[PDB]
Ligand binder design. Structure first.
Ligand SMILES: Cc1ncc(C[n+]2csc(CCOP(=O)(O)OP(=O)(O)O)c2C)c(N)n1
Ligand SMILES: Cc1ncc(C[n+]2csc(CCOP(=O)(O)OP(=O)(O)O)c2C)c(N)n1
Ligand SMILES: [Mg+2]
Ligand SMILES: [Mg+2]
Ligand code: NA
Ligand code: NA
Lengths: 620, 622
């Protein structure tokens, strides 16, 4: 528990370690012909001290739940991360030279195929948010003794997402979290704005509620001391460093970001660094206190079937909140996050019933997603984030990186489409199906009534990858029996007859408009089949085609979304080339405007009358 | 101009104005049955003072280029924006009651169909970045006397994009920019984190380089004074206010965000507010000094044809930088913005030749897009932003709102696809076609060689809407003669014969892989047509279909992008149902990994061998 104040030999061993890490970073990037040795070298003493004095972890089990966490937010310093894990004895030294090869898992930036990596970085400014999720989990959910350390670059601090995380950590008193800022003066293509104005970094961190300490980032002794003192606040170690530290003629110079040393130069530089190393003996890592709780990864089931009634009206946004609160009674792993929209998404229902497991993330969608990713690391939590679907576009890079991180998070976006009415297009999600479908690990649920919403929540909880649930504002009727079985990739035919003329595919509000169109068309002796996809990704291609074959090959898809990347294009891509199949597509063709929900569905050509007229035109 | 220190009669008129603005915000939202009167009421004195004391603008010409700019970043206070423009005499007072109707343009949040709105807000945290672009333009490009005022909420300040803009304004010494923070204690669903800890707001703004003044936001006199002193720094007026100010029993209470007053309550509250108004006489706006320069809005033409030769090798990312620098010599309105990637996107070439028109935005893509939107307002500048295409996903909400803002900005994203090689997937754009295709005003250029890249830059400069140019890292051959004519929505058939068995659609690196596949397949007496879309949106449906009908109805798309929302899906959606047409699709099926470019194209099934195998399979299945 006490700080072990290192003696001169331990300090020299830490310096020797830092210099070994420099040598390896150079060797690996020169061998690869690409990479960022100068970005590694500014961080070498930081890495040596964290891994070989401060942190506590099992060197042979990097994912162990009791370990301190390290997040390399400046992910292009990956070679020095790999070098520390070789120094710690987990990774074979020889493998370091295979950096960036297709035959290796030592890829250009860290990724979770590496046991020692929890989240992928490489898109700057995201690691601190993930670290915040890890620290929040450690302090409030696991209630364990592990600490969380996150290394950032100085150019990286221009990303607004970093400052969302800074504010989150002070709001939530993450006194188990340390941010290390590698203030090496330079970004990629010029000096970072503040250069070596260390006092301005300190003021910014202090103003955001952090205990901020300026250190010489190349002093192993100052680093040991600064890391050795816990605080009652999140702690920022503001390290003055030089980019390319230890590389004579490159240290502190522009024009070297992401530039490997040519072989002749690497050999000369490595010789000079090696001349400064006093012993080949390596420091051993020190193991953690094993106080993280056991976690059960069993499937999570709703405590009962849905208790809706066919014909009753409920918006799927409200059904989401009810279903999430219900699921929270079945497993303590379920956590909810929301960005100051809990009264609109109905995640407030979960907050009321399970307040200890609700995280108010404020108006900061980027950070919210990163918090969720962090909470899901090491399978600790099962997170459900929510906001308006439109505002998940604010977090697309975090979502993109979440898939690269192989993260299991659940996102529920409300207020989709023009059917929200009067707020207008700033609040209307019209591109969220395109966005989430383009995330390669995604499952996209579009529930059309309250029953389907509850089933989607339960399925999402038990589905790997990036799960998105699209909810809606109109109160529409319950159409499904409570005991209707739902599965990912299985659609439902909600209206059919022996002489259906076209298969109409709708979802959410447009499913209900399609059912209303069917009633209008019956008066003209025209029957239509109506199909509810349930999941847009994966799509039930078989049921769609079997339906179309019963309806003269004709499909009409109607969606409250733009034309590109949504339901209609998913359907077209699934059926193109099938003999006799035709697809007509109704969607929103341009930025909308304010009006009543029904007025906008009409203006944008996706209401019952537009559907009926499209059907009449197809038959003729 | 000297500060006009107001007399008590002017101050009382400003209070009367603020109370009229409260009344109108309540009347309009009660009439609509929705909206945010409490968010209007905290800002009523701020709005009165800005519009009727501080700012200079032409009340009958809100777009006038000499006017001070006002940006309502907290856009859900739109009813009070509409009320000020009625008070100024531009809008008819009766029209305010038509808020949110389909028959009105007084929509729920501000939009540029309103003459008095430059950028759409409603997605919080974006207005200050737009304002920074307006202020940068005013100080460095227009070199004019107009100032820029941006009103933000307190919950809104949780958005990181705000702090990017804060830092930008101090870096760039935007002493013509004022941010007004409506510190009304409350967000939507709870108190804002800092509540009324005014000293913490001050410390945060000062630490980010702003001159920060705490005021009573309901004191017209303190507001006049704080706005009346210009500074050498961007200035933050940190206004302590109460949400719902002036609505008895609602002021300072939770549970009222976005809740209109019921009719009975509106009538009673309005009576009380009206009892505080001393005079019905309105204040007149004061017009501006007309020192903004005249701008030439003519078509922009490259000064010469591309200077490439067929067979030369160049990466389209480098051709972009060369073309942009060349365009800068043809028009004074071209500006370039980049997020600390200028040596990778080659926007550095423009910086070297036209340094006064390059804006370093640092590692802050959200703000970069907003800056560009601000610079393009009132048609002052023609901006080209650049970064890696993957990092435009960090700015998708800004891009989305740029289309809602009817903005003409140009975005060039480099390093697309797996063909970048060793950096791995964090840098690989594999969803940018899906993203930009879902932006409704977008034109998506995917140039396959240096010639097509230069033509795309020129076309983009003259094309309205959100223009995206997808550039690439491999150094592929020039295939077009310099004198080839290019047009939005027109594809090119780059290889054809009377015996073609498939039409293969590729772009960028996969066009070159398709041409290599064609050379391989000729050894087996198999000819393929190869088609280069040029624009993915709009797609040349006619040429694609005419090509397919000459190649046994068969189309094969191949793309360095995920399957969803890219070239293959665009093509399938364009041709579905056409008799005899089939589409096969090669794309990237999962998150990639590091390797050499050619190794990754092979691993992910989008190289010459994958194309050749798919072609053979189509022939043999028939
Ligand atoms: C979101 C994002 N935008 C742009 C980049 C491109 N890029 C990679 S590293 C880098 C510079 C990082 O500089 P800094 O944070 O100072 O780190 P250093 O290498 O100096 O330690 C940039 C611009 C990135 N990877 N991520
Ligand atoms: C990016 C974004 N996220 C979420 C919202 C949802 N939303 C609309 S207004 C609001 C609260 C704004 O509070 P504040 O900024 O304090 O403004 P006030 O109404 O108090 O003046 C929220 C959360 C939004 N419009 N934009
Ligand atoms: Mg740096
Ligand atoms: Mg507020
Ligand atoms: Na990061
Ligand atoms: Na899930």
């Amino acid at each position: 528990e006490s700080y072990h104040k290192p003696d001169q030999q331990k300090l020299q061993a830490l310096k020797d370690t830092a210099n070994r890490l420099r040598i390896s970073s150079i060797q690996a990037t020169t061998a690869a012909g690409s990479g960022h040795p100068t970005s590694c070298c500014s961080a070498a003493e930081i890495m040596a001290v964290l891994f070989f004095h401060t942190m506590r972890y099992k060197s042979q089990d990097p994912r162990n739940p009791h370990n301190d966490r390290f997040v390399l937010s400046k992910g292009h310093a990956a070679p020095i991360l790999y070098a520390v894990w070789a120094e710690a004895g987990f990774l074979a030294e020889a493998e370091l030279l295979n950096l960036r090869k297709i035959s290796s898992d030592l890829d250009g930036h860290p990724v979770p195929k590496q046991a020692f990596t929890d989240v992928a970085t490489g898109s700057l400014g995201q690691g601190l948010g993930a670290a915040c999720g890890m620290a929040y989990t450690g302090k409030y959910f696991d209630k364990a003794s592990y600490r969380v350390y996150c290394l950032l670059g100085d150019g990286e601090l221009s990303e607004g997402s970093v400052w969302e995380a800074m504010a989150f950590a002070s709001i939530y008193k993450l006194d188990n979290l340390v941010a290390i800022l590698d203030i090496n003066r330079l970004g990629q293509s010029d000096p970072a704005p503040l250069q070596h104005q260390m006092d301005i970094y300190q003021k910014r961190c202090e103003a955001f509620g952090w205990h901020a300490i300026i250190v010489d980032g190349h002093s192993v002794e100052e680093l040991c001391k600064a890391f050795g003192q816990a605080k009652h606040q999140p702690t920022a170690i503001i390290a003055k460093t030089f980019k390319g530290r230890g590389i004579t003629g490159v240290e502190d110079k522009e024009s070297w970001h992401g530039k490997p040393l040519p072989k002749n130069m690497a050999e000369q530089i490595i010789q000079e660094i090696y001349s400064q190393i006093q012993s080949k003996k390596k420091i051993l890592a020190t193991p953690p206190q094993e106080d993280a709780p056991s976690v059960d990864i069993a499937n999570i089931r709703m405590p009962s079937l849905p208790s809706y009634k066919v014909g009753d009206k409920i918006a799927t946004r409200k059904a989401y909140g009810q279903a999430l609160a219900k699921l929270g009674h079945a497993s303590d792993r379920i956590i909810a996050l929301d960005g100051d929209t809990k009264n609109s998404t109905f995640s407030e229902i979960f907050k009321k019933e399970h307040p200890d497991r609700f995280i108010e993330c404020y108006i900061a969608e980027q950070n919210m997603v990163s918090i969720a990713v962090g909470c899901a690391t090491r399978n600790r939590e099962v997170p459900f984030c929510s906001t308006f679907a439109a505002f998940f576009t604010r977090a697309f890079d975090q979502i993109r990186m979440a898939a690269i991180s192989e993260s299991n998070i659940n996102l529920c976006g409300s207020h989709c489409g023009v059917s929200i009415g009067e707020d207008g297009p700033s609040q209307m999600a019209l591109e969220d199906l395109a966005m989430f479908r383009s995330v390669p690990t995604s499952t996209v649920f579009y529930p059309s009534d309250g029953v389907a919403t509850e089933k989607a929540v339960e399925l999402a909880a038990n589905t790997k990858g990036i799960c998105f649930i699209r909810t809606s504002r109109p109160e529409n009727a319950i159409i499904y029996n409570n005991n209707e079985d739902f599965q990912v990739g299985q659609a439902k035919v909600v209206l059919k007859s022996k002489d259906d003329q076209v298969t109409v595919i709708g979802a959410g509000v447009t499913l209900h408009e399609a059912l209303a169109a069917a009633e209008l068309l019956k008066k003209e002796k025209i029957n239509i089949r109506v199909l509810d996809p349930f999941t847009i990704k994966p799509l039930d291609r078989k049921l769609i085609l079997d339906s179309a074959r019963a309806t003269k090959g004709r499909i009409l898809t109607v969606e409250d979304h733009y034309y590109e990347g949504g339901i209609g294009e998913a359907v077209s891509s699934a059926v193109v080339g099938e003999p006799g199949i035709t697809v007509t597509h109704l969607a929103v063709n341009r930025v909308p405007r304010s009006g009543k929900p029904a007025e906008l569905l009409k203006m944008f050509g996706i209401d019952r009358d537009a559907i009926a007229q499209a059907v009449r035109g197809l038959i003729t």
